[PDB]
């Protein structure tokens, strides 16, 4: 579960609103050369923009009979405690899945994009990382990182400071030797040396995104992308009806609030 | 303009698309649905999506579009991609639920419900008269009692 | 030295020669020019219609 360790800040802001809207204020204008006693023509004003993200809500359910609870106490399995922990664990896993790939519908189509499958600019690498040379693997990952940096005009706030790649590709990089002619040092050990600010992460979620693996660089800054979980996991008090105990647990979670469009970049195919 | 109907003669009863929870009842969430899905109407299930009744061969009536109390103020409408975005289509498929009826219809208790199957505004409206245009026999559902003006609480014997 | 941020980034990521080490073009410059501090700017991206280092 690497998303919450992926640097993205989580914002529980709009409690039960069905949408979260953010506002941006941009200053426009500039100074003009003026004389000693002249009336300027340099006016500084500002405009703004708005960006909205819908909020959806997930709700799970568990239940147990008293016969169930007492019988399982033979095994030392505490069905209330185990069900609550299953609710919490599934909620954490769901948050990870939502942050990385968003939400997919039960029928199969997908409604909200996450970090991996967002509409960033996506370039396809030469070939698969396994088929790819150590120098060319370094070149692909570094070309991704610096292409994102050029896209953001190298602003420290929006500059990609993290990269997540499938565990297959991350292991390949960590173990692919850059060039045998220099030393045994790996591609990942070269990237971690020439990019001392980018922390390379991994996730199984990236193994197949839209029919092909997907590496992505992004900036883990509040003002670049946030993880909107307006309603953390709320577990209802146990409803006992006769001897049947029943628990619901809902959390209202927006997707990944990608505040700025070109705040991430994709390598499709590696 | 101003508030409609300053003073009403009687307190209006249950609005259409409402489910009584004293009786056994089931409202089931469908995530994909059609934009402009009118609440308080029979809704069909087509191509794996809850959408409005329209002239078809034999639509799969999936129930009654539940009216959201904490929804957007406005016409009873399920919306996608707005400030009033509705994430799922809440559909009442079991129990007693209120559905609009054709203004011509004059039903009564234990009468077999007929939904309207037309590409018009009357889509999904209930009726007793089976000779009404586009009268589709909803399986195992009966009018129970007149709640509001042109709204009847019907009973779905089994799930829809 | 000031170079456009694209050129500075390419300097700081392009390894000098993989056969020698992972040391990048920028690292080689910083080692061979112990007195030169290599900066970057964005306004150097298109001065005069063509990227310019100074």
């Amino acid at each position: 579960l690497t998303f919450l360790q992926g640097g993205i800040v989580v914002n529980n802001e709009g409690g039960y609103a069905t949408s979260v809207t953010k506002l941006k204020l941009k200053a426009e204008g500039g100074f003009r050369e003026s004389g000693n006693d002249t009336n300027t023509t340099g006016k500084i004003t500002l405009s703004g923009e708005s960006d909205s993200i819908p909020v959806f809500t997930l709700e799970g359910e568990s239940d147990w009979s008293e016969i169930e609870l007492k019988q399982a106490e033979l095994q030392n399995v505490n069905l209330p405690s185990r069900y609550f922990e299953a609710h919490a664990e599934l909620y954490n896993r769901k948050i990870d899945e939502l942050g990385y790939l968003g939400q997919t519908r039960t029928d199969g189509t997908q409604k909200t994009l996450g970090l991996l499958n967002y509409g960033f600019v996506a370039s396809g690498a030469g070939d698969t990382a396994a088929n790819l040379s150590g120098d060319n693997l370094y070149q692909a990952i570094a070309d991704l990182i610096t292409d994102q940096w050029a896209g953001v005009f190298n602003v420290e706030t929006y500059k990609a400071d993290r990269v997540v790649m499938p565990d297959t590709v991350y292991n390949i990089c960590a173990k692919k030797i850059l060039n045998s002619n220099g030393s045994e040092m790996s591609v990942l050990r070269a990237l971690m040396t020439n990019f001392p600010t980018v922390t390379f992460g991994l996730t199984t979620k990236a193994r197949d995104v839209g029919g092909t693996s997907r590496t992505t660089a992004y900036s883990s800054n509040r003002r670049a992308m946030q993880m909107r979980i307006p309603t953390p996991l709320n577990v209802s008090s146990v409803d006992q009806r006769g001897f049947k105990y029943y628990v619901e647990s809902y959390f209202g979670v927006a997707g990944l609030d990608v505040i700025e469009d070109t705040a991430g970049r994709h390598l499709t195919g590696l | 303009m101003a508030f409609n109907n300053a003073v009403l003669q009687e307190v209006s009863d249950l609005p259409a698309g409402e489910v009584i929870k004293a009786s056994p009842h089931n409202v089931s969430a469908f995530e994909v649905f059609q934009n402009g899905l009118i609440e308080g109407r029979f809704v069909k299930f087509d191509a794996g999506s809850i959408d409005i009744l329209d002239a078809s061969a034999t639509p799969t009536i999936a129930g009654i579009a539940k009216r959201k109390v904490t929804g957007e103020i406005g016409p009873g409408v399920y919306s996608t991609s707005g400030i009033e975005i509705d994430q799922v289509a809440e559909v009442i498929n079991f129990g007693f639920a209120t559905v609009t009826v054709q203004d011509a219809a004059a039903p009564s208790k234990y009468d077999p419900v007929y939904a309207i199957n037309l590409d018009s505004a009357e889509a999904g409206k209930a009726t007793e008269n089976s000779g009404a245009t586009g009268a589709l026999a909803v399986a195992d559902c009966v009018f129970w009692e007149q709640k509001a003006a042109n709204v009847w609480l019907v009973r779905m014997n089994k799930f829809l | 030295v000031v170079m456009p941020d694209t050129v500075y980034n390419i300097c700081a990521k392009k390894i000098l020669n993989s056969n020698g080490s992972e040391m990048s073009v920028l690292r080689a410059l910083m080692t061979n020019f112990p007195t030169v501090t290599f900066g970057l700017t964005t306004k150097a991206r298109d001065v005069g219609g063509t990227s310019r280092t100074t």
Partner: peptide, 24 residues
């Protein structure tokens, strides 16, 4: 009919304001 919550209240305009950023 419809609902009870006015549409603009179903949206939480974030208190955090994001200033526009320019090159360094």
């Amino acid at each position: 009919e419809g609902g009870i919550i006015l549409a603009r209240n179903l949206e939480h305009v974030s208190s955090e304001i994001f200033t526009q950023e320019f090159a360094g």
